[PDB]
Amino acid sequence: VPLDGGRFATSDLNDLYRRVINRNNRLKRLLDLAAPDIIVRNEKRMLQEAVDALLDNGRRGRAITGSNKRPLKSLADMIKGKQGRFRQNLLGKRVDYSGRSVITVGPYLRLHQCGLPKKMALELFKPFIYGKLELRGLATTIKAAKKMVEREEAVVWDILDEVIREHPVLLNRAPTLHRLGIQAFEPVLIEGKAIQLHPLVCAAYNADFDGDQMAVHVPLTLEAQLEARALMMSTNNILSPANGEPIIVPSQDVVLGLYYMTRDCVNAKGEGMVLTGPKEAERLYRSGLASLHARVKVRITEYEKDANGELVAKTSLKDTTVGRAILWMIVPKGLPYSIVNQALGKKAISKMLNTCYRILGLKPTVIFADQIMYTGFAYAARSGASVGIDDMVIPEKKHEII
Amino acid sequence: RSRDWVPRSVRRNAREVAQAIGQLEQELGRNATETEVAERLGIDIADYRQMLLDTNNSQLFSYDEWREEHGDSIELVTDDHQRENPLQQLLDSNLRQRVMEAIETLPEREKLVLTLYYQEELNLKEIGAVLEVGESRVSQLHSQAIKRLRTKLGKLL
Amino acid sequence: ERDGLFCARIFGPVKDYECLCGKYKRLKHRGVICEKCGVEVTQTKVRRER
Amino acid sequence: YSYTEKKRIRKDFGKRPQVLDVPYLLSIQLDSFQKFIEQDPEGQYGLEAAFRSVFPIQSYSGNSELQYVSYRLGEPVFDVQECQIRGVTYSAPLRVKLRLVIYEREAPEGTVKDIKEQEVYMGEIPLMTDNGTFVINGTERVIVSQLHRSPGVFFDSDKGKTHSSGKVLYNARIIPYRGSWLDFEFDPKDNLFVRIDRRRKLPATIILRALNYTTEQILDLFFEKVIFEIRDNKLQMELVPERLRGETASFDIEANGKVYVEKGRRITARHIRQLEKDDVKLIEVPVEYIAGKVVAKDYIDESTGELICAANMELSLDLLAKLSQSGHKRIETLFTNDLDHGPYISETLRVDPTNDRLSALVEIYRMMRPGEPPTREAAESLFENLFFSEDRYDLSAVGRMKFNRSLLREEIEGSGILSKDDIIDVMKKLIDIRNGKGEVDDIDHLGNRRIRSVGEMAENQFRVGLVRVERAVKERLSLGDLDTLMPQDMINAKPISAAVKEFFGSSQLSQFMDQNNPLSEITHKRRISALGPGGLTRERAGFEVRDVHPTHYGRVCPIETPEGPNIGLINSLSVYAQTNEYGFLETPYRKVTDGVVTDEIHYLSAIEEGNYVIAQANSNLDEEGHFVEDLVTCRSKGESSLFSRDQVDYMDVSTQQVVSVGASLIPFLEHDDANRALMGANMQRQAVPTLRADKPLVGTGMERAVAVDSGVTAVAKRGGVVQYVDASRIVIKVNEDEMYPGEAGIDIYNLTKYTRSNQNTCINQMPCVSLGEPVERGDVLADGPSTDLGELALGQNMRVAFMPWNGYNFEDSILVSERVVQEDRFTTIHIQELACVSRDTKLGPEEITADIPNVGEAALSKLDESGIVYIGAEVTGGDILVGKVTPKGETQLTPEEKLLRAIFGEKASDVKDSSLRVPNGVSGTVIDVQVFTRDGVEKDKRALEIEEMQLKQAKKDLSEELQILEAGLFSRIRAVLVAGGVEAEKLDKLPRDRWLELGLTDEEKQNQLEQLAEQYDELKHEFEKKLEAKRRKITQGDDLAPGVLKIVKVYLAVKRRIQPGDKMAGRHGNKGVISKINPIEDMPYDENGTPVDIVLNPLGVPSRMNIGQILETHLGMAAKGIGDKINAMLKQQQEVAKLREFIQRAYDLGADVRQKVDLSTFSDEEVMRLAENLRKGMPIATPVFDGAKEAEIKELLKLGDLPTSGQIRLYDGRTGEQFERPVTVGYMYMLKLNHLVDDKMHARSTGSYSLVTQQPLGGKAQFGGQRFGEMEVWALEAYGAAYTLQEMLTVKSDDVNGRTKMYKNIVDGNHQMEPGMPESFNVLLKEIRSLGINIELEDE
DNA sequence: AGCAATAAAGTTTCCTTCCTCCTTGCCGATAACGAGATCAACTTGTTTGCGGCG
Ligand SMILES: [Mg+2]
Ligand SMILES: [Zn+2]
């Protein structure tokens, strides 16, 4: 094929065919004369050498090159190594209806949601849009669809909103180690160029928010739509198949919020008085009358369903920190009160989750988790939280030991 | 000569410019004052100007690496002009049936000449021989059908 | 050029699926032989196959 | 201080007395090319080394010869700037002295035959800037300096190769600088073997005969003679006492009359003492001691001539008898202390088949030249060539020198060719370590690695061209006429240029320059490799070199080399690193004498140090005594430990010498993890300058030096006073004493305004200077892109306080206000370059023209008449730039477009458009155009317009120049008329030219009118000649490729500010993404209402331990207050003496900081400007390890009247209540980067494809589709979703029918599927059958 | 409004047509120089199979 400035580009195979042909034709010409045989001998050794060198250059005898000192690539390496069809071009594939961008966080979100910069999905759901403009009769045909589209009317965005609800997608970090390296989320449009993302699934992806990039793919058809909604959707994929473990761990922050709350000082104030329920601790602390971290007696109403799957209501009083009182506000009607009576190390929360799932089923655990995130981030912000040079501790008894 | 696929007097001129340009670069002792090429080879400027194309531009290969080791090849960086496009044939067929939509109401032959010439890619005056009217009327009705299909709106202008 | 590596007679005309007289062309009516020049015709894009 | 330094001072807290000011930093490239070009007479390098090396050439007969003399260069036609503009390489001519001498072949040497001593042009070559680069074709580039292993000799031993043995195998290697390598080695069974350039194994001894040696002499050299003597029946034998050492007695070892060692008995050291003592060598012994011994020398019957036993053959008693009979009462044999003296040669020998020399040469020949007939002389020639021809072999006496040291000779020098003695010494040294004596050595030791530089490369390449020449030169010497064939008739100069131009364009090393920031260039220029030719590779090379070696100390920075596959390989030069003259390294050290550190220096090697001891700089000097403390941590032996005080020889200079400059500049390195420091400085180069140049406050001291030697800025060439100033240039007038007499002495400076980087960025220069002001030499006169007042400025300093906020700082993510975008103060520019060319077709020429068909005048409205846009405009994707058009042929249409023409009726010309247009997604501002057109062609009108406006520019510039110059000269041309009378006002009132005729006296003064006219005519002559030259050079057309008519080229401009996704960090690896911007009003704020800028995540302080960022943060809050206290005073307008005291005390804080300052020196206005600068904040130097202390941070903070820890009460913007705890607050100085949000994003629905296989592409540039790997498959398999992957493999990848009909169904609302088969499958099938196979398929 | 006539104008065909150029094949004029190498690769490396190789 030719180039801009008339130049050409070629496949080397051709060259190899040609030499063969020349030699053979020579051999015919020679044979027509019955010539002395030695010439024939040389002619055919050169023949077969040309032949196999076509097949695979530097295997038997040393390889033929161009002027560059580089081989005239044979057949075999259409098929071989990574470069071959199998491993390059056949199994791993370039794709349309796809894209990528940088990521970030949506904390407030719900797990199943995912941030979309506008113009991306705008481009991506193009033929749907066109179907709907010929449907409504705005774009009676295709052209005016395009033209209003590149004019970007308000109806355009309205119609996108019409579509993309319930219109899920696939998202991908590289490299894919285990099957959770991809998931199946549901869109939410956002005004930027950068994706927001639910925090907790940094770990399924091994992601850190310091310059990642991800790609996005599409269940165009319905089968895949429903599979992804049913299978790779975030609610489904919360325990390892390797070991029956919650993989949804709150790593580092919200843990701290809870630990700071669920804690028992002695020092501050109000030590050892009496209440009806947690709603009065809300009354007080939102007025700022009590240390949340203070053991004080109150009354609680705990539930169990020790009957044949039927609840058993009871209530009683507890010398407990106040944060535990609040944190009972959210527990979904199945648990004892021992659950909170410690200052909640990481694994306590692991078992919080486990047990909740073990007995009460699934979606309560999910919501429980979500609200744990919201609330612990809230009180983490409330927390007052930093470090200094002066928080660094040197024991006085190091120099003498040395 | 068998292996090369370019003509001969080409290479005569090439050897000649080589001799001359070296000879005269020795005469002068410096380079690139092409008017010297013009005079010494007093034929024309466009002569060597074209020859420069004709000779000095050679073959290159397809799969060579793209430089700063093997990011991609030259087989990635390629462009084409003769592509497929889906809606032009689509609306072409729409307009074909619109031609029918116009001309089915019109004289017996002209619908047929324009059909069977434009539909299955047959012969035009093949019918001019059938009627034997001189195609004056053919011309006229061709024009009127144009005037009738300047009665619709379609982009792809 | 004919009788070479790109002898289009065998592999196919670059003038993609054109006949000799140039009546039938370019994938349009595949199972038509040019009734004018009597050239039996195949290979639009079977320049990828033959 | 200097004037520039008086402007703005940066404090210090360093405390150690510095000796040295840093050198000129990039001296080395300058040196190398300087010495390469320079006409050396004798001490040859580069050029003359090559010429005098290929000292003259004679014919295939030997009849005639050309002769070298000497050379010279020209100067370039074009200046720099035209070259970069024009699009051309910058180069120098070459001019050569030569003498074609011929001598009469009738006469013996009748030299007077013919002499043509003429001159010779041959080729241009490129030259260097004062900065370092070579521009090529208008492209600034850089080559790298290399490292690799020396030539010479090398020893090693592999360990259990045939691991069944688990045995050592020693071996030796020889590597000439040029020519063939060579390998000697052992086998599992203790025999010697050899190979050239890894030829097959061969016995060594063959070659020894091939070198005209007999076995007798062989073992004479290698072996000391075990002499028996046959005294009339019995065996006696000579003995050295220390041969029987650790050995056991075969019989009754005794004396003539005295027993020393009984049977079975080890010859202890006692008996060695007895035997040396009592004076015995000749000892009676049984005849049986022989049988098993080997004859040393082929002993015969002298009457017969019969080998009774061939040499190197075991001995016996029947042979004893026959030999005793022969008249041999003495038998030399080999010694075999297999412990020490093993007869490895004897073994290797009697494995060897050959005896004659000739057939040995033959067998070597037939090995290396297989099949070819064994012609004697051919083998002789082969052998001589491989090691004894100057043509194809050399050492680079460095090789010779290193080798002689490895020989333990004395003589540094030698030849470029081997000797026999030397080789023999190789053999014995190899066998000696094989016995044990001595050792093999290492690779990482830098003492074995030599660096390699530009001039050497050029040397090699052009001399290659010289050889290419010499070929045909000889070809025609022997044959043609001699009288008439001029010397320069014979030659060509293409190939030389080809070598030069290629590796300046083809080598891996030659690289674009990294124009992002000053650091980028200077350091990328100091960057070192072991790759390319004569080097190594990633996959083969392993860990051994990547790691650290102790000798790197103070030569190489350990803390700057990337994270990619090329981790440890490339590594930057150290600070005060220098090179040995050879290509080795060196580093300065302070001598320690009598305990006193002598203030001298020595640049000491990578070898020498292992002998001596070094003192450390963190050591506290005892103030003109010695090192205070006893156990000083000194170092030697590839290690460190604790030594006394008197003991030391030498000391380092600084605490810094190890690091890179990129490493050196973050302060408080002394408080954080290494890998953090790595990534910190690694991204530190990768920044972007803002619009503006904001300083830091927390420094190290060096920023000025790099600000200087980057060479970006204006400079004070020569002192003066500012003459003229503007937004584009200045003029200076030069001081008198500095004004040497010849020129009128006025520098000027046209500046570089908005200009493009190769990373596509806004470049510019600006004054930081005023008018009517003095100038000292050297100082700058205008800033560059990213600096201020001779100090680096590559980020901005900003407020921050750190705590969680609502999950917007989950993992290091960042959150900020929004005022800063009002200030646009991280906003920057990305100007983009674009072109469009006219060409001559086969048919005819492309044309450029406004008129094009089917055009809306909306498009055209912005174009001139030739079809070109008006400057200053603002534009968008789809817009058109260049009405380029193309004369075309014809087609055979079909009734389809026939009828589109019947309908539309827009006539197709014989021409199409080929216009330049804005790419999709882009919109911006035009500000400049250029055009290039050939010599021969009419210059398209606006190119004439611009050449004309350029003439207006140029002539105006030169007019200005000469007008000023001659305005100076009119001073004389008035004044000297005053000499010789007075027309006090009749001079001046009447017109000035008409002064010559005024009062006119004879004697000397007619000449004075005459010389008046002379200078006038001289001056107008300069004017005209200058116009001529310059106007030609501008008007001179262009040099172009074939087929080209002319080109246009365009620039653009677009300006980028923040949208989230944007990356940033500080100087500590503290990376960061933005998650949101904040309105001010939800921002946390303070007692006094000031909200904050930036907010942060403190979970990741200890996790990686980037702790120093804290320290500056205190300081980041700290010194600010001072400026506020001053600005408070300022707006209050207090009093000078208040400033005086307050400032002096700001500087008068520290205990023992070295700098100490007074200001009663300085004047009032100086205080005013200084204060007026400082109002924003007081900047400081934190030296790296001689840093400040917590005493001092809290000292400044206590003057600043604040929380000592500086961690304080804040209230919420959102709700307006206090947080729980105080929080540490302050300022960082931080950055932005080029991994930007717009640079990276891409989507794709549908577009282009491949052609061979019709599947999509990749790349945002080419509207790329994304890849879907097998890993992603395996996952999908894990879930088990068939239809999904089915789809993406069929329709979104290959199946074309599939993609089509699915698109159809979608727009129809139909979300359904139909599959096919991939084409790529059948492609595989066809490859298979092409390979000669009946691949096929079984139909259902 | 439908239908034709005369005149004019531009053609595509198209075909020769004779200038000119251009390209496919052949054979020729003194006499003798040297068997190539030519500018490369740096030896990854561990495991495994098979031919020798005793
Ligand atoms: Mg990351
Ligand atoms: Zn046909």
DSSP secondary structure letters along A8-22: B---THHHHHHHHHH
Please tell me whether residue D1230 adopts helix, strand or coil conformation.
strand
Contact assessment for residue A196 and residue A114, using Cβ atoms and an 8 Å cutoff: yes
Among D93, D489, D854, whose Cβ lies nearest the Cβ of B26?
A: D489
CA atoms of A114 and A201, how far apart (whole Å): 12
Candidates D259, D299, D689; CA nearest to D515 is D689
* Pairing relationship of beta strands D698-699 and D650-651 according to DSSP bridges: unpaired
Candidates D1230, D1234, D1209, D1233; CA nearest to D1106 is D1230
Contact assessment for residue D569 and residue D548, using Cβ atoms and an 8 Å cutoff: no
Candidates D1134, D1198, D1189; CA nearest to D1167 is D1134
Q: Which amino acid is at D345?
A: I
Q: Which residues touch strand E (CB under 7 A)?
A: A 69; B 7-9, 137; D 173, 181, 183, 197-198, 369, 371-373, 378, 381-382, 392, 533, 536-537, 539-542
Q: How many CB pairs under 8 A join A and B?
A: 28
Q: Please identify which residue in the block is written with the tokens 């991939």.
A: D1318
- D1208 backbone φψ class: left, alpha, beta (φ>0; ψ -120 to 50): beta
Interface of A with B (CB under 8 A): 3, 5-12, 22, 66, 73, 142-143, 147
CA atoms of D287 and D230, how far apart (whole Å): 9
Ligand nearest to the CA of C22: 2
User: Distance from the CA of D410 to the center of ligand 2, in angstroms?
Assistant: 92
Residue C39 CA and nucleotide E16 C1' are separated, in Å, by: 29
Nearest nucleotide to the CA of D198, by C1', is E43
Q: Specify which residue's alpha carbon is closest to the C1' of nucleotide E32.
A: D479
Please tell me whether residue D319 adopts helix, strand or coil conformation.
helix
Q: Measured between CA atoms, how close is D1321 to chain B, in angstroms?
A: 20
Chain E positions with a protein C-beta closer than 7 Å: 3-4, 22-24, 35-45
Ligand nearest to the CA of D1063: 1
Among D892, D1319, D1326, whose Cβ lies nearest the Cβ of C22?
A: D892
CB contacts of B2 in chain A (<8 Å) are 22
Nearest nucleotide to the CA of D478, by C1', is E33
Residue-by-residue DSSP string for A331-376: S-SS--SGGGSS---HHHHHHHHHHHHHHH-SHHHHHHHHHHHHHH
Contact assessment for residue D616 and residue D652, using Cβ atoms and an 8 Å cutoff: yes
Structure tokens at D104: 């009469």
CA atoms of D946 and A303, how far apart (whole Å): 90
Q: Which chains sit next to C, with 3 or more Cβ pairs under 8 A?
A: A, B, D
Contacts of D70 (CB under 8 A, 6+ apart): D39, D96, D97
User: Distance from the CA of D33 to the center of ligand 2, in angstroms?
Assistant: 71
Residue-by-residue DSSP string for D220-244: HHH--EEEEEEETTEEEE---GGGS
CB contacts of D1205 in chain A (<8 Å) are 388-390
Looking at the complex, does the CB of residue D188 fall below 8 Å from at least one CB of chain A?
Answer: no
CB contacts of B120 in chain C (<8 Å) are 29
CA atoms of D838 and D276, how far apart (whole Å): 99
- D197 backbone φψ class: left, alpha, beta (φ>0; ψ -120 to 50): left
CB atoms within 10 A of CB D1271: 18
Describe chain C by its helix, strand, coil percentages, rounded to 5: 15, 5, 80
Q: Which amino acid is at D491?
A: I
With helix as H, strand as E and coil as C, how does D837-892 read? EEEECCCCECEECCCCCCCCHHHHCCECCCCEECCCCEEECCCEEECEEEECCCCC
Nearest nucleotide to the CA of D479, by C1', is E33
Nearest nucleotide to the CA of D539, by C1', is E44
Query: Is the CB of B155 less than 8 angstroms away from the CB of A73?
Result: no
> What is the resolution in angstroms?
3.9
Looking at the complex, does the CB of residue B87 fall below 8 Å from at least one CB of chain A?
Answer: yes
Q: Which chains sit next to B, with 3 or more Cβ pairs under 8 A?
A: A, C, D
Residue D189 CA and nucleotide E54 C1' are separated, in Å, by: 15
CA atoms of D1010 and D989, how far apart (whole Å): 24
CB contacts of A7 in chain B (<8 Å) are 57-60
User: Distance from the CA of A53 to the center of ligand 2, in angstroms?
Assistant: 42
CA atoms of A334 and A302, how far apart (whole Å): 8
Contacts of B116 (CB under 8 A, 6+ apart): B122
Please tell me whether residue D1054 adopts helix, strand or coil conformation.
coil
CB contacts of A98 in chain D (<8 Å) are 1243-1244, 1265-1266, 1268, 1292
Contact assessment for residue D91 and residue B31, using Cβ atoms and an 8 Å cutoff: no
Query: Is the CB of C22 less than 8 angstroms away from the CB of D1326?
Result: no
Query: Is the CB of D895 less than 8 angstroms away from the CB of B121?
Result: yes
Interface of D with B (CB under 8 A): 93, 119, 121, 124, 488-489, 491-493, 840, 854, 894-896, 898-900, 902-906, 935-936, 1039, 1042-1043, 1248, 1251-1252, 1257-1259, 1262, 1300, 1303
Q: What residues pair up with D954 in beta bridges, in sequence order?
A: none
Candidates A5, A190, A209, A191; CA nearest to A115 is A190
Residue-by-residue DSSP string for A198-238: -GGGHHHHT--SSS--EEEE---SHHHHHHIIIIIBTTT--
Looking at the complex, does the CB of residue A11 fall below 8 Å from at least one CB of chain C?
Answer: no
Angle at D626 between CA D625 and CA D627, to 5 degrees: 140
CB contacts of A231 in chain D (<8 Å) are 1279-1281
**Which residues of C contribute to the annotated binding site for Zn(2+)?**
19, 21, 34, 37
Looking at the complex, does the CB of residue B146 fall below 8 Å from at least one CB of chain D?
Answer: yes
CA atoms of D1307 and D103, how far apart (whole Å): 92
CB atoms within 10 A of CB B55: 16
Nearest nucleotide to the CA of D175, by C1', is E42
CB contacts of D813 in chain A (<8 Å) are 104-105, 209
Q: Please identify which residue in the block is written with the tokens 């364009």.
A: D505
| Experimental determination approach used | cryo-EM
Return phi, psi of residue D796, to 5°: -150, 150
Is A212 part of any known ligand binding site? yes
- B37 backbone φψ class: left, alpha, beta (φ>0; ψ -120 to 50): alpha
Residue D360 CA and nucleotide E41 C1' are separated, in Å, by: 27
User: Distance from the CA of D480 to the center of ligand 1, in angstroms?
Assistant: 73
Query: Is the CB of D894 less than 8 angstroms away from the CB of C26?
Result: yes
Q: Please identify which residue in the block is written with the tokens 């001039």.
A: D455
Give the single-character DSSP code of D746.
-
